[PDB]
Scaffold this active site. Sequence first.
Site, PDB file in Angstrom:
ATOM      1  N   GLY A   1     -47.474  24.522   6.286  1.00  0.00           N
ATOM      2  CA  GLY A   1     -47.612  24.441   7.638  1.00  0.00           C
ATOM      3  C   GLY A   1     -48.495  24.502   7.512  1.00  0.00           C
ATOM      4  O   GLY A   1     -49.595  23.666   8.716  1.00  0.00           O
TER       5      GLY A   1
ATOM      6  N   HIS B   1     -49.137  12.619   3.562  1.00  0.00           N
ATOM      7  CA  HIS B   1     -47.467  13.230   3.821  1.00  0.00           C
ATOM      8  C   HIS B   1     -46.483  13.531   4.888  1.00  0.00           C
ATOM      9  O   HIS B   1     -45.410  14.383   4.682  1.00  0.00           O
ATOM     10  CB  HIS B   1     -47.460  13.730   2.571  1.00  0.00           C
ATOM     11  CG  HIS B   1     -48.005  15.605   2.755  1.00  0.00           C
ATOM     12  ND1 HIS B   1     -49.440  15.723   2.261  1.00  0.00           N
ATOM     13  CD2 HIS B   1     -47.507  16.538   3.624  1.00  0.00           C
ATOM     14  CE1 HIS B   1     -49.688  16.858   2.986  1.00  0.00           C
ATOM     15  NE2 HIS B   1     -48.677  17.005   3.517  1.00  0.00           N
TER      16      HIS B   1
ATOM     17  N   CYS C   1     -51.040  22.352   5.804  1.00  0.00           N
ATOM     18  CA  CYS C   1     -52.154  21.328   5.530  1.00  0.00           C
ATOM     19  C   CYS C   1     -52.803  20.761   6.960  1.00  0.00           C
ATOM     20  O   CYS C   1     -52.429  21.126   8.504  1.00  0.00           O
ATOM     21  CB  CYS C   1     -50.625  20.642   4.805  1.00  0.00           C
ATOM     22  SG  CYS C   1     -50.587  20.422   3.116  1.00  0.00           S
TER      23      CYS C   1
END
Lengths: 306, 306
Positions: free
Chosen positions: A143, A41, A145
Amino acid sequence: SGFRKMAFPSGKVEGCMVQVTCGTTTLNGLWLDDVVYCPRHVICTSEDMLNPNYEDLLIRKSNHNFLVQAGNVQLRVIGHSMQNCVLKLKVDTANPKTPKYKFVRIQPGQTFSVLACYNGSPSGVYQCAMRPNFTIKGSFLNGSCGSVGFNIDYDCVSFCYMHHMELPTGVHAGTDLEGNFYGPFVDRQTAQAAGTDTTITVNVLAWLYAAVINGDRWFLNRFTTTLNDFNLVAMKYNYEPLTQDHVDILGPLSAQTGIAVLDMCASLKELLQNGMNGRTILGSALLEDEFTPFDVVRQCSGVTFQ
Amino acid sequence: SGFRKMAFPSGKVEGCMVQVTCGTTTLNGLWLDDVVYCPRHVICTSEDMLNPNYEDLLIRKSNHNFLVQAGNVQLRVIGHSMQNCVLKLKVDTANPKTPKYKFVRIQPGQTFSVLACYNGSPSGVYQCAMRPNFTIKGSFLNGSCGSVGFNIDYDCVSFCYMHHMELPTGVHAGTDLEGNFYGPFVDRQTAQAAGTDTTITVNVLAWLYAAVINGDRWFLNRFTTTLNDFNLVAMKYNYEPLTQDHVDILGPLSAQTGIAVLDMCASLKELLQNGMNGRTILGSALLEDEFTPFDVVRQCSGVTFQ
């Protein structure tokens, strides 16, 4: 003596963390050999996340659209592909600090260390457990991820988790390193329910054994019980049922303390029915279920790793 | 979201851990530049520990009596000296992985990460706090001496603790990197009492603020209070008295939540008098005092470090 939520040393993983940027979305990547792994993503904008068609979105992206950065030095992308929910970016340079690693899909009730990262930089380390509902109770901000969960076995690093999303009740969900989610979650910005969270009974028993090793024995009563009788009490309190395999796994701890597993179950039964009355166990006023029997042995024997 | 006992990344410290052997006693050392630091009781036998005369014992030791080992490679000792309770072994090779470091004596109530080591190998990482009685509630087994506590500030490592001994009630004591103990403890195998352990009030308030940031607000009541009135209640429950300096330190957290510090004190007063009635805060049934206000900001903002 003593007992604490202990994490694995993060040195071998810190050298594999990079920063991946696509458009305005920036997140963390795992640099192993000449391949970088990151959540897919990253190719989404703030609007694409509501209902992303990842295939169609990937059609409009090329190699030069991915900015991979390791410190002050950046990596050139020469090939990209999508495997389930993770992107595999092929880079021109192999990571010189690549450790001997594996990819494992870990089972619920097991534990691992999380290296929380932001913009490709390690921020902190902590220990988590895979809940039976396939979520984790981590500590993640925006942030984060691409941060990975790992285990160390001697000199090998076992990567088992990559952070992808946060659930509306505060728990966290993610995939393995092959892009497959843990649980029935999808990488969509939509309402998604997590199942009922049950207590890992075998982990509670291991923690109770660690307390006995470290002085706390007030919960030890006179009674014993059977597997069928304890499990009947465990189902009322949303506890996982105990099996003979769990008894064999607790073998090292029962032999070290001289307390049979069934005897410890009767002590856990009284704590489930009568509570703790204000007394603490290993500095905790609740029953801790995020220590596997293996983690307790490690803390009470002292295995090292390189 | 979420909150966990988070430790600093241990990568910069793993490369400084070595193994120090003198006779049959083996423990851990800190290799910085061409000097190795380790607890001075490595020169003791099992009998010397009852009443050690460290000066006289050091007279009978020479450079070649110290076996320093970094992995499969060993270091040659070319000079030794005793600074308070630590030994400084001068070696022939400087540590190539030496990070930019400091030596700091940390104050009670502050926190740090511990890299528990055995035979010079990192075993695990966890977060501790310096209790007001100058002990720590760590996790240490035999051979863990020489393990160091540290903080990371951007790219610098702040060494503040080295493990030396275990107290007969299970807590741990040690020195700074200049050999000075925290507290009135001596490196003797004799009965030594630790003072009363009080709760770090400013840390409890920071933890309560983290809960408010993460959803838990049931403990928030209607009342406010004053510093003098709250401190009168805090002395009955063995809590550290709150000062105006503590109020200014909590400034970032009070401004983020919109809850004045004095308002949070009134909520803590009711929890001290009435208990928790079975409700949990951030997954804990007790009041947690091992998160400094700075640690909470770090977890709720996301500072990275290199």
